[PDB]
């Protein structure tokens, strides 16, 4: 109840406009970047749990889950990783500069391939290749569940979560797919994209598929 | 935020103890009864929509969805039917007598088969054959989302929903399966049970299955 608006650090706004507007051919790379963030987030909690085992109690199962929601033309990528607090969502996703933000844009301009985005540490923004709106729902052991939302505009919002399912711990990336990128809602397409660019992932990757009983 | 307790009409409490304690052999009948309630609830909104089309706008897709959640040993049966208001959950699920409640118990005592429960209009309670706890999450166009919860005790609770996913319209029956009835979480078992006792259902029945990418 009651949002909170924040301005995006100027360069992040540029990058976003760039990503969401590049005619780029190979938009499927966004899944690789998101699954990668999910994996690192899971490494984080695993490592932290080394000296603080109780930390995994909020969600003992470590996994990455992709859930397509046709009716709402939404694609969700979830992980039971370390999660983010209200402060971290604000920091990590928009108000703090980000080292490679400008460097990547400069590299892109020089001819670099969009797929290099992840090497600049800003792969998250690659989601705008297939979605024009996103909701990052997170729950860290250190805070409540919050929704961070953006549509590539110069500003984003953070609202305490009182509308989504409770996630024990972790993050959900709710991607509102563009009208021409609804192929990522299909199991085959998803399955194949995950196969080629994500072969060495330490955690199970679950695909949630809704099938009408024969 | 803030529950509200209510006592169960005495006979419903009896029936529940009976169901949750009957050694009965054919516990799988609960799915047939629940899918049946789901169907009737969908008929209700379809019919009402005949003269009030805007009523389907909250959720244009009419369906029944079964979603097993292993980690939490939970089984969910959802429908985008008419849904129930706070008042209706209280009325329909516990505080109002219910014509066949006593008649069915008398019939059972005479030797009747538990599967007749649905003919007495109290099939919902058959869920206690496989679950020792249940949450009925509902959203009617006429109210907010609420959670009705019970564990066959003499009382139940109703809380405004600020923790579950938003359902456009309809009801979710979250069944917390008993430790020895976890077979209903399996796709095959579910698939076969649905096949035998639910052949003439007017709406699509979707099974949500989580598969780890090969
Ligand atoms: C802050 C934590 C943990 C970090 O060390 C991990 C690696 C990358 C983080 C990138 C982010 O900016 C946030 C993020 C994104 Cl974008 C995502 O799609 C999935 C996630 O699970 C996280 C996250 O929860 O990240
Ligand atoms: C009140 C409405 C609509 C009624 O006319 C329909 C038929 C049966 C109703 C039985 C109930 O007692 C509530 C109920 C149950 Cl138990 C269920 O498992 C699923 C449902 O969708 C409803 C419901 O929403 O019911």
From Swiss-Prot, chains A, B:
Record note on what altering residue 22 to I does: Induces a 6-fold increase in ATPase activity and a reduced client protein activation activity, leading to growth defect at high temperatures
Chain sites annotated for binding ATP: 33, 37, 79, 84, 92, 98-100, 119-124, 171
Residues in the signal sequence: none
Cellular localisation: Cytoplasm
Effect of substituting residue 170 to D: Induces a total loss of function at 34 degrees Celsius. Abolishes interaction with SBA1
Effect upon mutating residue 97 to I: Abolishes interaction with SBA1
Factors inducing expression: Expressed constitutively and induced by high temperatures dependent on transcription factor HSF1. According to PubMed:2674684, it is constitutively expressed at low levels, however, due to the specificity of the antibody, this result is unsure.
Protein task: Molecular chaperone that promotes the maturation, structural maintenance and proper regulation of specific target proteins involved in cell cycle control and signal transduction. Undergoes a functional cycle that is linked to its ATPase activity. The nucleotide-free form of the dimer is found in an open conformation in which the N-termini are not dimerized and the complex is ready for client protein binding.
Similarity field: Belongs to the heat shock protein 90 family.
Record's comment describing the protein's domains: The TPR repeat-binding motif mediates interaction with TPR repeat-containing proteins like the co-chaperones AHA1, CDC37, CNS1, CPR6, CPR7, HCH1, SBA1, SSE1 and STI1. CNS1, CPR6, CPR7 and STI1.
Note: Present with 444943 molecules/cell in log phase SD medium.
Quaternary structure note: Homodimer. Interacts with the co-chaperones AHA1, CDC37, CNS1, CPR6, CPR7, HCH1, SBA1, SSE1 and STI1. CNS1, CPR6, CPR7 and STI1. Interacts directly with the substrates GCN2, HAP1 and STE11.
Protein name: ATP-dependent molecular chaperone HSP82
Species the sequence originates in: Saccharomyces cerevisiae (strain ATCC 204508 / S288c)
Parent-protein residues present: 1 to 214 of 709
């Amino acid at each position: 109840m009651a949002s909170e608006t924040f301005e995006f650090q100027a360069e992040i706004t540029q990058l976003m406009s760039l990503i969401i507007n590049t005619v780029y051919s190979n938009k499927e790379i966004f899944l690789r970047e998101l699954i990668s963030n999910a994996s690192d987030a899971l490494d984080k909690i695993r490592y932290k749990s080394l000296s603080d085992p109780k930390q995994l109690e909020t969600e003992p199962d470590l996994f990455i889950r992709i859930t397509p929601k046709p009716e709402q033309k939404v694609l969700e990528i979830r992980d039971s990783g370390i999660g983010m607090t209200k402060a971290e969502l604000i920091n990590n996703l928009g108000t703090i500069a980000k080292s490679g933000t400008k460097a990547f844009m400069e590299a892109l301009s020089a001819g670099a391939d969009v797929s290099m985005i992840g090497q600049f540490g800003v792969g998250f923004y690659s989601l705008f290749l297939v979605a024009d709106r996103v909701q990052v729902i997170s729950k860290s052991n250190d805070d409540e569940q919050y929704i961070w939302e953006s549509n590539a505009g110069g500003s984003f919002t953070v609202t305490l979560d009182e509308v989504n399912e409770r996630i024990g711990r972790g993050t959900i990336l709710r991607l509102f797919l563009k009208d021409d990128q609804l192929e990522y809602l299909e199991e085959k397409r998803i399955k194949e994209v995950i196969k080629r660019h994500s072969e060495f992932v330490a955690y199970p990757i679950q695909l949630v598929v809704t099938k009408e009983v024969e």
